[PDB]
Design a protein around this nucleic acid. Sequence first.
DNA 1: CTTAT
DNA 2: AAAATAAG
DNA 3: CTTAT
DNA 4: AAAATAAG
Lengths: 242, 242
Amino acid sequence: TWLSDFPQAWAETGGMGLAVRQAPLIIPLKATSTPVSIKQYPMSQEARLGIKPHIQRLLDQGILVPCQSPWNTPLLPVYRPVQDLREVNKRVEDIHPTVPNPYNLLSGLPPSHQWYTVLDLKDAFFCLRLHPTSQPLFAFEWRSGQLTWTRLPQGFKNSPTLFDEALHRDLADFRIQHPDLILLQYVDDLLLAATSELDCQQGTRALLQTLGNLGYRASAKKAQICQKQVKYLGYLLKEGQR
Amino acid sequence: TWLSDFPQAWAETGGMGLAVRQAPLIIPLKATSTPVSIKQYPMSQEARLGIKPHIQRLLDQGILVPCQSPWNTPLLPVYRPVQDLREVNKRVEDIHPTVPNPYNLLSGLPPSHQWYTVLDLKDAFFCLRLHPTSQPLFAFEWRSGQLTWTRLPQGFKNSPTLFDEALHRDLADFRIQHPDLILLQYVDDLLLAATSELDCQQGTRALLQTLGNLGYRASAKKAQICQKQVKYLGYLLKEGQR
DNA sequence: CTTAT
DNA sequence: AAAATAAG
DNA sequence: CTTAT
DNA sequence: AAAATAAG
């Protein structure tokens, strides 16, 4: 099957990802920023017990590490952990938003290509390492001491754009090696389009091989492979339409 | 004094006015209007006793008369009577508003004329007769039966413009006979301006003589006569300014 | 929990 | 202007 | 009183 | 959206 032929490429089989070609990201602060330390509002035991195994899993994976940081933002109860990074986001320098909106992205899909594969990357932001100089920015309290992220975190205002740009760099060669394929990227949502069933097959094989080699991981459960009809970015792609 | 020389011209001395050159006004209705009869909400005895002598005075003056009309609008308590004519106003055809705003009106006042007389006409709208065909429009209940107005009423949406235009017609000749005077009209508020004190005197004498002959009445108590400084339309007119 | 709309 | 919502 | 803003 | 206001 597709699952057995590409064990590195699927999240179910290849382990947590890590984008090995991408240098750890440095997050520039605005020119006047200083750290902000917001104390953790006490969490109920129910929420803490809900969050705890997620925290432990992330620590086992090296995605969280202990630290001491002059930055601190609160975790809130849902259970799965969500960090209120609004005060960090305010102090981080803005970048240009380069992620295209889905409407315009879909305009680049010609009627000559109607064999589609749709892949979504699992834990996409976590595949991008954070430079140790920027890791203390995202610290939170866990009960005593702080933890922080060694990967690009959820809730950080620039993660979608940074991820989109990093994947574009990692897939630049794939595009050059397959000039007859159409590859649409929307952060962690990918659409490959081909003229024939066969070229979609051989293209999807190359793309999964490439993704897994680069350290990204696609969801086997949700993958729509080599179909004439697929759902992508909330559209149903059926017969040139939408 | 000015009071004794022009007894017909002042409200204090010449009786209620009546514009004898002005034909009784016909009030055209909108093309689709039919009469509206709003019942009188009961008035307290206190309000009725407050209103009663005003009603009796107006009846003595012929400004109110008994009638039976398919139109009826309510009187409200203040005591002095005020009629809610909003439903009548909605059914009466609109006219172009020709009363200038005071700012632009004052632009027509050159610096060569700095001797001023300010007159305000008392009970101005009541000087204009209503044609009997239009009198039933303004009927109200008085406790049993209806009364209505034989003169242009307060609260009617077109009274200011109709009065301004009627007075302009009645003073057209005065303007032609005194081309060196400036006469500003704002409904019932008049300003005469002249170059010298003497010409303001002889002009103010002619204007009062003319007003009284036409059936209008100026307030002697409030009159500012032949002064280099006067209050007009909320401005203080002092030394070319304002 | 707080806080932007 | 403030509670009702959505969101970090 | 009702009702427009 | 509704009470608070001004107005006929």
